[PDB]
Structures are given as structure tokens and as C-alpha cells.
Amino acid sequence: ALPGEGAVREVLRPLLKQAAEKTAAGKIVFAEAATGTGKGRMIASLAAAAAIKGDTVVVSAPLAVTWQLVNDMKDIPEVRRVGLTLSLGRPNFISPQRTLEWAIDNERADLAAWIEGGGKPLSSHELCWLLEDALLLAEDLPADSLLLTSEDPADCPAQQLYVAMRSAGIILCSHFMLAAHTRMMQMRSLPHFIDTLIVDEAHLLEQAFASVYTHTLRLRPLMRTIEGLGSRGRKPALDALKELFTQMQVASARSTLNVPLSDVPELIPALKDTVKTLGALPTKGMSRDARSVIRIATRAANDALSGHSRLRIEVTPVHSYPMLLSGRSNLQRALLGLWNATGGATLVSATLFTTGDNGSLTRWKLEVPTERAAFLPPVHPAWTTAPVLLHKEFCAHEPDDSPEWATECAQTIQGVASTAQGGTLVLCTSYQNTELLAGRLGAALGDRLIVQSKTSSAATCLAQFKAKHKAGIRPVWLGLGAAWTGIDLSDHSLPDNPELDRLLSDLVITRIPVGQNRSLTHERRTAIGGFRIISQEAAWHFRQGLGRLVRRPGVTHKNLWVLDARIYGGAAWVAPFRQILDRYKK
């Protein structure tokens, strides 16, 4: 037996046994278990067994689920022997100054108010300024430019937090920490070699790598920084940034899209001049604020100049906030560098596969060597589907971003709000759909409707959903983005009475989530694999969206609605999404 195997639920013991075995054998184990099965105890036992063997063990997991992970591990007597610590590196926090400035710059009152409130945690010392919270507040946050770096002045609150939090057999870190560690490891805090790696919520890991390997040149705060400097080299740098912005206008007009360097050679002169000038103004007498701003800007411009990254131009015709994104479409090299510094690994997530035991997509995303992948059978008990009603109602008009489609879909959603026992989460695939559905549902569902938009984040909507449900209303949340994948809609006021959990009683998927992924990795994956990758990403996102209904066993009165007309229209390409839905009693 394994340390803490008695704490693990019986339904996970075969998964745990195979995972421990194959991980000790040097395999990258794929372990998918339904949310609410006690996966934290399984991970605790895996890490305890590995560290008991003398292995360096690292558990990479988001800080949202890290409190309970430490709680599950601190109960194992052998874990209390070999040591447990948290490597709360700088890739975990944001820069309060830069993040504030960004929030006012882009009119995000939620993010601005959270930064002004002290960055206190939405979910030793109290952890604040977390990157994951800011991402829940700005799904499109440019983490790269706002992450707390070692070049930040020590009077920064997040910098002081990192230094204080820098307070050993089992090391626990976040996905972003592990990605940044991989990056710094490959160049010419954490173990240089990972004997045993365990990744909770592995489906997020790839998104953490792409974020770490993305560079972001934001022109407005950079120019505003240089304006408040000495006149030594100010005029050339400002002229060069102006030339870069003009060239960005020209290059975005050149073709109307994630395009490479060779498609926009006009920026090449521009960025080289920019870097040159950003290195020519004297460091003598710059506060480390401006030092960070300018060095981050030079790094971003050089990564753009690399020719190995792909660029996004966001300029005046389309985006009031000028910005140059340069990300990698090929984290192949990065994640192989990771796995080569790893003896064995267990990837744990509620959603690892797409339409089956099929872990092809996820193995491609994390670039696991095919000779090390070990696909275990997924564990989904009966209670994930037993208290669920899959209703037969749906919108006849196909989802086409039209006024007519909104007019019909909103009637169906109105009926759902009419028969709902508690809250209702209506998942959407774009802000345009949210705005149309809000236009039709506003007057009737008043003081019940929550409209998630570019000005109302997923987490402010989450807090409001919880609040209006606590007040006895049956709130109806038109949500998107993290609402598909991130939110945990289980009533924390009823930890021991799941039969009374009515926080989310009716989930309504408006559209098949085709096209929710816009990352460079997925774009290249499509350019290689085709509609296979498109459909598999859709099915994966769809299973994630379904995973918001039943978060623990013993719940009752959960209703599921799928309004997409193509689901019931007899088209062949919608074949996977029906299979998943056939796991219910309609």
C-alpha cells in the first residue's frame, strides 16, 4: 500500500495504483477523474509514495486548489517526515503598479478596483496579487508584461510579498512557476531534475506555458514612461516608438489574423530602431519602475525580432490600446525540455480526453513523447450523471450571431428561468451573443440578469451570482470564457448538505464551443491536423462546460439544456457532442 492510500476514495484506487506504478517506471501517466471524486487525496498519496522512495517530488497545481492540496498532504504522517513546501516564485504574482495602469488604460473597473483594494485573494502570509485572480478579472490580461519580475523595486507590495513568502521533499508550485522554470532551464528555485512530477488540473498546464513564452510590447505605458525621463536620449526613443506605431498601422492594414515576421517586414526596421533607442537612454537616475518597463519592452521587441515567434498587431483601427504580441506556436521544444528533466509524471484533471479515452489532443498539447504516454482509463462514477435532466428543448434557429437567433434563444432561456429552482448559468461563445441575449432578456429578467462583458469580468459575475442566489433570487448569468471552464459553482454554505445545493440548478449551453481557442499553439495544430483538431478542441471545451453542473456526489435537481440546433439536426460532424450527451437520461 501507499502512504495515505487509506485516505483515498475506493473508486480512485485502481487509477492511483496504475499511476504510481507507471510513474515509477518512467511514464507520463494520463489520469482523468471526475470532479468530486477526491483527486486531491490521490495526488497526496502519489507524492507521498514518490518522496518516500527518495525521489524529488513536485506538484504543479493552480493556487486555487492548492490550499486543499496542502490540507490533504499535511494529514499523511510520511509527508510530515520528508517535508512539504511551496515555491511561491515571482511568476505567481502581478505588478500592482503596471496592472493598475493597465486596468485604467483599458477601462476595466473590476481589475482596477481589485488592485486598489490591495489585490486581496478572490479564492503563512496572505497571498495577494495572484496572477490567477487577475486572469479571472481580465481573461485577456497580458500576463507577460504585468508579471512581477526581479527587476521590480522592493517597495512594490507584490515584491515584498514574494520576499516574505520566500520562507523540501515534496515541493508544490503553480503551472506558471513550472513553465517559467522550464524556460529558465533552457537558455544557453526548483529541482534541476524532477524525479516525480504530479500536475493537478493538467488541462491548464499548456495555457500556462504559452503565457510564459509570450512577449508583449505595450506602447502607451512605455511612451508615458519615457516622457517622464531626462532629455538625454528621450527624443530618439519617442520618435522610434512613434515610427513603430505608424508601421503597425501600415502592417495591420497590409492584410486583414496571427501573421509572422516575414509577412510584415516593415516592422523590422521599426523594432530594431526601437530596441536601439531603448538601450541608449542612460540608466543613471532611473527608478527601477522605468528600468523594469524599458527592459521588459526591449525583451518583447527582441522576441518579436526573433523570427521564431508569431505576431499580433493591435492598433488604432481596431484596438485603442496599441500592442505587439509575439508568442510561440511551437512549445514542442519547451515541453520536450521539460519532460527530459522529468523521471516520471502523473497528469490529473477532470478533463484530459476528448470523446473517449482519446488523449491524442492533450498529448499533442503538452508534447508528451509518444513512447512515454500512459493513458489510464478515466474514472467517472454514476453520480456525475444520475441527478441530471437533459431536456429536449432547444433553439430552432441555428446560432449565427443574428437578431433572429437571439429572439428565439432568449425565449427558450426565458422558459428555463421560469422553471428554475435556483441559479441559471447560460454559457455563450462570444460577447456579441451575450449582448444580443441580454438585449432580449433585459426587461423581463430584471435584477435577475447578470451580463458578463468586457466591463463585467467572470469573477465579478461569479460574486454576483453567489450574492443574488444567497438573497433568494434565481439569478441568470449570461457567461463566457472562464465560465465554461473555471468557476466552481457549488454552494459553500452547504458543505455537508449537497442535497440542498441549488447554486446552479439549470445549465444552458447555447452553442457548440467551436472556436473558443485562439492561441497560437491551437492555430498551428489546426494548420497540421485540420478539422480533427478543430472538432476535438470543440468537444474538449464542451465536456469542460458540461463539467460545471455536478461538482460533488449527492446533489439533486440539476437540469441540462443544449439549445444548439445542430445538436438535433442530424449533421454528421456533430456526432461527438451527442455521444457525450448520450451519457444522460433525456
DSSP at 378: P
Residues 6+ apart with CB under 8 A from 424: 413, 416, 417, 474, 475, 476, 477, 504, 505, 506, 507, 508
CA 113 to CA 130: how far, in whole Å?
A: 15
CA 275 to CA 22: how far, in whole Å?
A: 49
One domain, residues 471 and 429: yes
CA 126 to CA 463: how far, in whole Å?
A: 20
One domain, residues 72 and 136: no
Pairing outcome for strands 504-509 and 476-479: unpaired
One domain, residues 484 and 538: yes
Pairing outcome for strands 423-427 and 504-509: parallel
Confirm whether 3 is domain-assigned: no
With beta carbons less than 8 A apart as the criterion, state whether 552 and 499 touch.
Answer: no
One domain, residues 291 and 346: no
Q: Where are the beta strands (DSSP E) in 194-253?
A: 194-199, 215-218
With beta carbons less than 8 A apart as the criterion, state whether 175 and 182 touch.
Answer: no
With beta carbons less than 8 A apart as the criterion, state whether 366 and 335 touch.
Answer: yes
Nearest Cα to Cα of residue 244 among 306, 319, 324, 342: 324
Q: How many domains are there within the chain?
A: 4
DSSP string, 430-490: SHHHHHHHHHHHTTTSTTTEEE-BTTB-HHHHHHHHHHHHHTT---EEEE-THHHHT----
One domain, residues 453 and 574: yes
Q: Where are the beta strands (DSSP E) in 106-231?
A: 170-173, 194-199, 215-218
Domain that holds residue 390: 382-581
Nearest Cα to Cα of residue 436 among 407, 461, 413: 407
Measuring CA to CA, how many Å separate 286 from each of 225, 234, 299, 337?
10, 13, 18, 37
Question: 244 in the Ramachandran plot: left (φ > 0), alpha (ψ -120 to 50) or beta?
Answer: alpha
Angle in degrees, 0-180, between the axes of helices 332-340 and 175-185, rounded to the nearest 10: 90
Confirm whether 240 is domain-assigned: yes
Measuring CA to CA, how many Å separate 179 from each of 67, 91, 212, 569?
21, 9, 6, 43
Beta pairing partners, 314: 323
CA 332 to CA 7: how far, in whole Å?
A: 37
Nearest Cα to Cα of residue 202 among 350, 11, 19, 340: 350
Confirm whether 541 is domain-assigned: yes
CA 197 to CA 2: how far, in whole Å?
A: 17
Confirm whether 259 is domain-assigned: yes
One domain, residues 95 and 82: no
Position of cell 515576421? 261
| Domain containing residue 468: CATH number | 3.40.50.300
One domain, residues 121 and 29: no
Give CA angle at 288 (283, 294), nearest 5°: 65
With beta carbons less than 8 A apart as the criterion, state whether 450 and 475 touch.
Answer: yes
One domain, residues 443 and 549: yes
Number of other CB atoms surrounding residue 401 within 10 Å? 12
Residues 6+ apart with CB under 8 A from 112: 100, 103, 104
With beta carbons less than 8 A apart as the criterion, state whether 147 and 95 touch.
Answer: yes
CA 338 to CA 294: how far, in whole Å?
A: 30
Nearest Cα to Cα of residue 146 among 214, 245, 205: 214
Confirm whether 107 is domain-assigned: yes
Q: How was this structure determined?
A: X-ray
